[PDB]
Design an enzyme around this catalytic site. Structure first.
Site, PDB file in Angstrom:
ATOM      1  CG  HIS A 100     -22.488  -9.916   7.309  1.00 55.40           C
ATOM      2  ND1 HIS A 100     -22.139 -10.659   6.202  1.00 55.40           N
ATOM      3  CD2 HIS A 100     -21.993  -8.673   7.101  1.00 55.40           C
ATOM      4  CE1 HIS A 100     -21.460  -9.898   5.364  1.00 55.40           C
ATOM      5  NE2 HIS A 100     -21.355  -8.689   5.886  1.00 55.40           N
ATOM      6  CD  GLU A 421       9.469  28.022   4.244  1.00 56.59           C
ATOM      7  OE1 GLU A 421       9.960  29.169   4.333  1.00 56.59           O
ATOM      8  OE2 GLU A 421      10.157  26.987   4.117  1.00 56.59           O
ATOM      9  NE  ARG A 606      10.206  22.958   6.636  1.00 59.39           N
ATOM     10  CZ  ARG A 606      10.198  24.132   6.015  1.00 59.39           C
ATOM     11  NH1 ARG A 606      10.712  24.241   4.798  1.00 59.39           N
ATOM     12  NH2 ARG A 606       9.720  25.207   6.632  1.00 59.39           N
TER      13      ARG A 606
END
Lengths: 643, 325, 636
Positions: A100, A421, A606
């Protein structure tokens, strides 16, 4: 030892070379394809007769298997840009190490090279550490500091970092080949992390100190895209700069002198030594000043919302909300004005008479006329799905498609009411816009024609988003409720039909029908919250809603139809106007195959995922269920004509 | 034009457009009617209003040069095809059309005075696409002409030369009539960006005060003695000939001495630019444009009355007075 | 000294640096913007506080004036890609010098670096020479040789060139600051020149010697686009290669082994050391073999032409020409077959009945069905321009525009008949598709409605080419003539009306009318030549016709109506069928009302794109046309 290496660019190259010089056996190398200066890992691997691969995702099971087959002793990652996760990492017994580009734990993020210049750091370095679940969080095996000179820019520092990397690897690689290793664990409270830079991160804001801006131009200097600003509408790039600590009474952003070119900052001034105007060639500051048209001193209407189906719930509340603010002009379109009648006199509201099934050009015209478009006209009524499928299809799909295509043609933003829906019978605890599968029944269960129709529209809009550049936002409301409910026979989107029906039951003295016992659970949302969210979508701060699909609902509000009945009944019985209405007829359990007609399939739960709403809108529903129930019921009962 | 027509009592004006903002003061006038419409979208609404009215003035078109090369097909679609649709409405319902032709039809014509009835029309090769505007407009004039000859259409074509005054169109606006050069320079002075002189800005133009121009246009609408029937009329002031550079100098001079000057940035200066830079490649420019106003005198008994300096000063004054500070 | 420098890339940078190190004063630098490794001349100029410019063409008068104001003593060109021509060149009294990347006079063309590798040269160098009208031809002031090692590739050799240039300039630039230079003229008969390379030049042809191919990959090696070949349909790039003198009985192009990957060549074999499959990553040869699917032993429809208005002259001859060849399928579309009837039974001819003013979907359908489209329907008859302008406009413009838009929608190639009338009153000696201005009269001269209609169509087709990617070629026929002339009242393009009229005059025994004396001259073309050109346009070899406007005409055949009359009469009187027709009614001078003074095409574009020239002299054309016509006339 045996190695599988993950490598890219210069660090990758020097890494592999240092690895070979250390006597490692590299079984295979993983890299990337080149984006349209850095040395090639693939070419190097090819020259050394090492098999090299560049899959998009190495974590695909196949590659896990292949890497497993190679049977590496230790793994090394040198500037591999894609992320390798534990499944592959745990294959090497001696572990996996990563190189790094900073002094860890500081700057453990990505593009450390640029970030340490942005922040004006006086030093940085390279770190070899032991990879783990958390990115760049692992124990430091080796680290080497390097001083950042005041005159260092990205490329020179890049080369210093590469040098330091070669040195680090050169001395510490032999130690790993044996098992001589120290692990200095990282101190997490000292950690600092940065993300990927976007060119917008290089925008020069002159109210900041000159040192910070100088650092900015140092960080993104050529070959990088460079720091930029604007002269009027014209964009220009500063390639090299010089800080002038001497202050000036001139306000930030003003041009102090053109020779040399000097911009006043919040503290000190910044000289632009070299730069370019737009896509033109680099030139000295004075010439850049001349071509940009700078001299001493120089510095550096309302949105039209078209609501189709404005006469009703969402139209009313959204119009109120939009007109509260000063920067919106609202065009309500519909076949009647009654529900919105109090806005008819408002200077910034415009009622437009129209019918999207008849009128073609009038609609098209108004889409062109406006900026953002909100198509609320549609038949959301479940019984109508089965009773009049062809009409539901014609209106909900085809006419709205006509409108969507207008929006594509005239390059307008469309905020489209998708439906909850669409999820259908999906079994997930939280319905997720971006993840959850969509489940519907067989063709012989026609109630799904509405769900599938809306789904296909979402996909066509999506397609237009990808291929033709349509700016869109989809939102899925979950049982919005509040004052001014749509009539049950109304062809507009947005009011919960269930609560309207129940309230109408209590008002009419008819029974509350619990369909199949009313055990199916729904989530309810106060219109205050919903309209807040929708307004936030219209605002579109930071363009964070572009291409987004957003559930708007309150998951903490969850009730079966039965529970809803009981709550509403409770609020009803104690209400001051109660005595004007008939006795409660009671709850009546009814089977699905009666009320909704045939071919009906109901969803047991739902519950929306509001993650996207939080991310995009910084939004959470604030209103408790009880208050919503009470306000809704109260407002409704008080509108009823009594005599 | 609305102002002029409503000053007299015998006109009923139906203004058609997609917004009313520029004309807002006429919305309450009993004899003005704003009608919502867009000639690219609406077909029947437009047709209806042509049947309803007597004389028709099709001002919708893209006149901005950069767009000729940048969006040729839209320029062609709007300036030619939609307007042909309207012309055909006028032919069908036997209405008078007063059509805005362009001074650009003459193109590179070398005559000292551009003559509606005489001068040849010169354009570059097909590979020089900026001419798509000029040739599109020319072909319409010919179609209108054909209809005049064969089907009895009553028409007058007029070609404005750099009309200027209060309330100039925005530079990106798809409506005809205000000089872009003047708008650009005034906006340059207002925004503090430099005035670009393309290839030195030595090309000469003729400029016209909107008072004179509108007088002429109104007189065309009047059609005294039916003298405008089948006529093509330049409306311009030939004594007002000036180069873009000179225009810059004049405007700058007027600007520096204006009471509101201190509210605007320092002048960035005149800066010479090559044609290929500003307009891109395939650019071909007109070295001089000077109208013959003979036809205007014959038909309208009209002559421009306004000195250049008053036009410059008034235009600049009004523009600066509209700017919000 | 004072200098204005024209510089680009590495040579530009090192050139400028050497120039400054020599104590020159650089007043300005002219350079280029960067297209999507090299040092920036602009970045350098900017760092050194030197004004730098990058116009597309510096020879624009403005820039010449600007450079004049700068008043340079000497001018230098280091790898400036755009061409600097004499006007600006002669402004510096001490002259102008150019740095070139070869041993001059050899390889004096452009991209010498790559060419010296392609040709397998063992040496090259850098030359400082004086500029002049001929490119890289001027007297050599300085030169330095470089050895090309067998293992050199483009980039390594490029850096060698740069080093040599730096040395050259370091020692010889100081001499120029004084005038201590010798000028050695170039030997012109020893010179060699090469042009610009396209990636298609890097295709590996395995029948060639392995040496040539090795050199090929050496020339274009990375960072350059690389040498490439195909395995079946899959393209692959060879980045590094190795020559194998060891032969193989295997025929050229077959794979001898996958490890190493070894391809048999015409002489020796070539090993692919590294390469890549398509846009994928570089890998060693063996892996490349595996991912390309190589093994030991592995190796490496008709165009549908839609002619609208096929019944007639161009339809007949073009159909004949197309069917002569093996690869075309012809769909003739028209309202009658009478003129083309002899092709109705031909397997590869298809007659489709249709009318473009009525039929919309039938036409659109047939455009979709076909590949290339040829819209020959239009009213070309002058009296009709004024007699029925609106019908002419409707058919010639609107319907054909519909057809063009079909072609745009379905991405088909359109070969469109523009008109010579588009030039109108243009005064140029040769009408040039790419250059000549177009001059027409005022709106009150309606005969021009046709010319302008056709012009605007050319412009719309052009736009569609530019913005929507329409593949098109425009052609402008000049008085084509031959057998099977169109009827005079016919709505199809292509037959010269004048000749038809004169022949019909001689046949009918009516006088030949010379309008205003018939002194105006026209150019006439035998249809064999014309249809050859048009056929060449359909072929589109090398895609050289894309976006092109091509006059098809014969400028050698220029004649007045009077001369034409004289010729046809001469041919007429001696013809075997003469006795079937009335006595000659004579020439009769007529007033204008009852025009173009010359029409002469530039055929340069036809030559360039089609490699085409008209081969047939006027007399044979006159004779054949008249002969076929007279023999075609019905008698009784």
């Amino acid at each position: 030892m045996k190695t599988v290496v993950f490598a890219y660019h210069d660090m990758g190259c020097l890494g592999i070379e240092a690895l070979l010089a250390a006597g490692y056996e590299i079984s295979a190398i993983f890299t990337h394809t080149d984006n349209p200066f850095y040395g090639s890992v693939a070419r190097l691997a090819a020259e050394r007769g090492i098999p090299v691969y560049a899959p998009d995702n190495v974590n695909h099971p196949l590659w896990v298997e292949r890497i497993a087959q190679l049977s590496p002793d230790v793994i090394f990652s040198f500037y591999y840009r894609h992320l390798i996760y534990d499944e592959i990492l745990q294959l090497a017994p001696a572990g996996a190490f990563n190189l790094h580009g900073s002094l860890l734990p500081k700057y453990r993020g990505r593009a450390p090279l640029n970030w340490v210049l942005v922040n004006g750091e006086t030093e940085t370095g390279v770190t070899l550490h032991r990879m783990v679940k958390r990115a760049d969080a692992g124990a430091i095996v080796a680290q080497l500091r390097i001083a950042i000179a005041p005159d260092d820019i990205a490329i020179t520092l890049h080369h210093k970092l590469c040098h330091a990397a070669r040195q680090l690897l050169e001395q510490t690689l032999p130690a790993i080949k044996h098992g001589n290793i120290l692990e200095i664990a990282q101190r997490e409270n000292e950690a600092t992390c940065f993300g990927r830079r976007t060119p917008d991160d290089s925008f020069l804001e002159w109210h900041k100190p000159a040192s910070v801006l100088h650092n900015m131009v140092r960080a993104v200097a050529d070959p990088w895209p460079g720091a930029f600003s604007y002269v009027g509408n014209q964009k220009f790039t500063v390639w090299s700069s010089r800080v002038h600590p001497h202050a000036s009474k001139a306000q930030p952003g003003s041009v102090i002198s053109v020779a040399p070119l000097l911009i006043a900052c919040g503290d000190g001034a910044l000289e632009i030594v070299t730069g370019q105007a737009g896509d033109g060639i680099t030139m000295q500051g004075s010439q850049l000043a001349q071509t940009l048209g700078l001299v001493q001193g120089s510095r550096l209407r309302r949105t039209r919302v078209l609501i189709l189906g404005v006469n009703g719930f969402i139209g009313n509340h959204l119009t109120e909300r939009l007109l509260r603010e000063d920067h919106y002009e609202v065009y309500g379109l519909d076949i009647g004005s009654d529900a919105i009648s109090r806005f008819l006199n408002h200077p910034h509201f415009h009622f437009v008479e129209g019918d999207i099934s008849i009128h073609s050009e009038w609609i098209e015209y108004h889409v062109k006329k406006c900026d953002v478009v909100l198509p609320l006209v549609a038949i959301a009524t479940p019984i109508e799905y089965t009773r009049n499928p062809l009409r539901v299809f014609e209106l909900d799909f085809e006419e709205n498609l006509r409108i969507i295509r207008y929006c594509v043609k005239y390059r307008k933003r469309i905020i489209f009411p998708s439906t909850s829906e669409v999820y259908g019978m999906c079994s997930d605890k939280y319905f997720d816009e971006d993840h959850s599968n969509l489940i519907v029944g067989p063709v012989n269960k026609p109630r799904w024609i509405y769900s599938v129709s809306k789904q296909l529209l979402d996909r066509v809009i999506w397609a237009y988003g990808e291929k033709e550049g349509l700016q869109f936002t989809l939102f899925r409301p979950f049982n919005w409720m509040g004052p001014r409910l749509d009539n049950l026979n109304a062809a507009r989107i947005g009011s919960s039909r269930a609560i309207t029906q129940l309230i109408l039951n209590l008002v009419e003295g008819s029974p509350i029908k619990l369909i199949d016992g009313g055990k199916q659970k729904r989530c309810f949302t106060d219109i205050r919250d919903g309209i807040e969210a929708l307004y936030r979508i219209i605002e579109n701060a930071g363009n964070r809603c572009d291409g987004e699909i957003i559930n708007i609902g309150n998951p903490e509000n969850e009730a079966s139809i039965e529970e809803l009945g009981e709550m509403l009944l409770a609020s009803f019985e104690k209400h001051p106007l109660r005595h004007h209405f008939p006795p409660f007829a009671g709850f009546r359990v009814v089977e699905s195959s009666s009320y909704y007609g045939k071919g009906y399939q109901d969803v047991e739960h739902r519950k929306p995922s509001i993650r996207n709403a939080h991310r995009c809108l910084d939004w959470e529903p604030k209103i408790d269920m009880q208050e919503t129930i009470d306000e809704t019921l109260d407002f409704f009962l008080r509108t009823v004509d009594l005599t």
